[PDB]
């Protein structure tokens, strides 16, 4: 285990007003699925709270979409420790690239079936429908490809898993925004709080160096909370291994490059919120929720906090910082993501 240092998030903490009834809904379609093979597992998929994170990102959306989006993480949650994460196929490339292509597929065109399905394929179906189907024509394209990135990214994940290396640093973090799967996240977001970028904002390289940045950054927060469980390919053994430390001493080194990364985010955000239209405006409000919404719900959940519902945590929150850690305003020198910098 390791020891984390205090948080900088300038923004102030947001909730949905009506996260009790929202959660409800998803509890009601997590039973209705049964999207668990026992009371244990139904215990421990409500208890990572997937609805709250949304809720915290969505505070203003309607509570019956924010429930919609929320199916889609409480699914991931559910597949992640089955399939992804854990078992087999998550240390063999060669089934799990077959495996993970037909739940791309469903998430393309949900009648798409298949004589063997994993468990729970009946609810991504469900939560498939229920998101898109209200979707605007533009959503659901984007909805498609970047449910297709992420399935693509832990691919990527299983391979490195597969031959028991680590990847270089400038390796990780090109891919680690397609592993989160943080495009389809934003994309939810969109879908949620009714908001749709425009091409030419989509396709601008500043609006890509902002999602890509914050991205990471979002990433990297949920590497250093979810580092203890992962252990009981992490920013921090991938810095012990290039830099030769030890995984406490990559602790500064990772809120280095977070700080780094989220201080270029925000300096992009400045450049982009005075001529923003009300779409990316939404997007840009959205990050921000997104910020808080991972920290405020991340060290609460017991996905992160507790080995099991019901005991005591083993991580409490490390606290609020005041200033940044690193105020450096240089690009970062790993070539995959140096180009970020370029758009300022
Ligand atoms: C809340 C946000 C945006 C980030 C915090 C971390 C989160 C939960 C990112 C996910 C945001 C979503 C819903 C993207 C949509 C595609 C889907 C359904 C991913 C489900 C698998 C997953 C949880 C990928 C996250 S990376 P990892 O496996 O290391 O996560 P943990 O083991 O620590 O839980
Ligand atoms: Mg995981
Ligand atoms: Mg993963
Ligand atoms: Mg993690
Ligand atoms: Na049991």
Redesign the pocket.
């Known amino acids: 285990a390791i020891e984390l240092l205090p948080f900088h998030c300038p923004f102030a903490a947001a909730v949905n007003p009506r996260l009790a009834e929202i959660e409800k809904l998803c509890v009601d379609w997590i039973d209705e699925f049964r999207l668990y093979q026992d009371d244990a597992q139904r215990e421990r998929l409500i208890a990572?709270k997937?609805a709250e994170?949304?809720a915290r990102?969505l505070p203003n959306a309607a509570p019956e979409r924010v429930a919609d989006?929320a199916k889609?993480?409480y699914?991931?949650?559910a597949?992640?420790?089955m399939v992804?994460?854990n078992g087999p196929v998550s240390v063999r490339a060669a089934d799990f690239l077959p495996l993970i292509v037909q739940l791309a597929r469903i998430a393309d065109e949900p009648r798409s079936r298949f004589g063997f399905e994993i468990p729970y394929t009946d609810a991504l179906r469900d939560l498939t429908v229920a998101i898109t189907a209200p979707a605007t024509p533009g959503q659901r394209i984007e909805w498609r490809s970047?449910?297709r990135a992420?399935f693509f990214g832990?691919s990527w994940d299983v391979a490195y898993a597969e031959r028991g290396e680590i990847p270089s640093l400038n390796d990780y973090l090109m891919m680690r925004m397609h592993?989160?799967?943080?495009?389809?996240?934003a994309a939810?977001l969109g879908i949620a709080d009714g908001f749709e970028l425009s091409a030419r904002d989509a396709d601008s390289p500043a609006v890509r160096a902002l999602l890509e940045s914050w991205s990471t950054f979002?990433?990297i927060?949920?590497?250093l909370?979810?580092y203890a469980?992962?252990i009981e390919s992490?920013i921090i053994t991938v810095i012990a291994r290039e830099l030769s430390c030890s995984p406490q001493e990559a602790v500064p080194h990772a809120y280095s490059i977070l700080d780094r990364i989220s201080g270029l985010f925000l300096r992009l955000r400045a450049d982009l919120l005075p001529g923003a239209d009300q779409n990316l405006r939404a997007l840009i409000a959205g990050m921000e929720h997104?910020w808080r919404?991972?920290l405020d719900?991340?060290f609460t959940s017991a996905?992160?906090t507790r080995r099991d519902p019901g005991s005591e945590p083993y991580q409490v929150f490390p606290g609020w910082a005041e200033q940044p850690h690193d105020t450096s305003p240089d690009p970062l020198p790993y070539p995959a993501i140096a180009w970020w910098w370029e758009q300022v």
């Open positions: 990572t997937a994170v949304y990102a989006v889609w993480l699914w991931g949650f597949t992640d420790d992804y994460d970047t449910a992420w832990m592993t989160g799967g943080l495009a389809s996240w939810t979002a990433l927060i949920n590497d909370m979810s469980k992962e992490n997104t919404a991972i719900w991340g996905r992160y």
